Amino acid sequence: KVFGRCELAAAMKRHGLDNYRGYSLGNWVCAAKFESNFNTQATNRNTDGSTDYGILQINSRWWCNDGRTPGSRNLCNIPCSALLSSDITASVNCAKKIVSDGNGMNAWVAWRNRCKGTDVQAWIRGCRL
Ligand SMILES: NC(=[NH2+])NCCC[C@H](N)C(=O)O
Ligand SMILES: NC(=[NH2+])NCCC[C@H](N)C(=O)O
Ligand SMILES: NC(=[NH2+])NCCC[C@H](N)C(=O)O
Ligand SMILES: [Cl-]
Ligand SMILES: [Cl-]
Ligand SMILES: [Cl-]
Ligand SMILES: [Cl-]
Ligand SMILES: [Cl-]
Ligand SMILES: [Cl-]
Ligand SMILES: [Cl-]
Ligand SMILES: [Cl-]
Ligand code: NA
Numbered sequence: 001k002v003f004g005r006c007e008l009a010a011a012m013k014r015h016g017l018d019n020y021r022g023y024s025l026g027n028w029v030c031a032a033k034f035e036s037n038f039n040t041q042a043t044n045r046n047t048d049g050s051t052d053y054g055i056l057q058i059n060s061r062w063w064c065n066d067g068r069t070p071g072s073r074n075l076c077n078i079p080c081s082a083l084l085s086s087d088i089t090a091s092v093n094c095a096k097k098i099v100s101d102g103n104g105m106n107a108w109v110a111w112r113n114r115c116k117g118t119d120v121q122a123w124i125r126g127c128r129l
Pocket of ligand 9: 082087088
């Protein structure tokens with residue numbers, strides 16, 4: 001599913017992501033924009049052989065099982081395919097664990113490089129929330 005901007009903001013809010021770990025809703029929407037272009041089915045292979053999955057490009061190296069990332073962990077206790085659903089619940093639940101891991105949203109390098117320090121409220125501007 002390719003979400004609209006405001007549509008994804010609403011879905012993230014209902015799942016409790018807004019201000020989660022102190023990160024306002026626009027941070028999460030900005031991260032999703034640059035990670036996946038709001039597409040739940042996004043996948044991207046990393047040069048180490050892990051893969052990033054879903055709207056927030058969660059990495060199989062640590063967070064989900066895809067069966068082909070040797071040595072990796074599955075800290076969200078889910079198949080990586082669950083992160084590709086139209087329903088964002090699994091991605092949100094796992095993102096909550098990632099952002100709680102010590103480095104905040106810097107775990108998403110695209111957030112650090114493209115969202116951190118910017119006017120992230122622009123990503124929810126105009127949305128009926
Ligand atoms: N509990 C964990 N294993 N977290 C991930 C550890 C490494 C982390 N992805 C890093 O490069 O900054
Ligand atoms: N650390 C991340 N945010 N990884 C997800 C993708 C971001 C990175 N610029 C890439 O596409 O390779
Ligand atoms: N229609 C929107 N509000 N899009 C997101 C805002 C974009 C933001 N101003 C930026 O600098 O990229
Ligand atoms: Cl917020
Ligand atoms: Cl915001
Ligand atoms: Cl881009
Ligand atoms: Cl594996
Ligand atoms: Cl949803
Ligand atoms: Cl889900
Ligand atoms: Cl933080
Ligand atoms: Cl920040
Ligand atoms: Na894994």
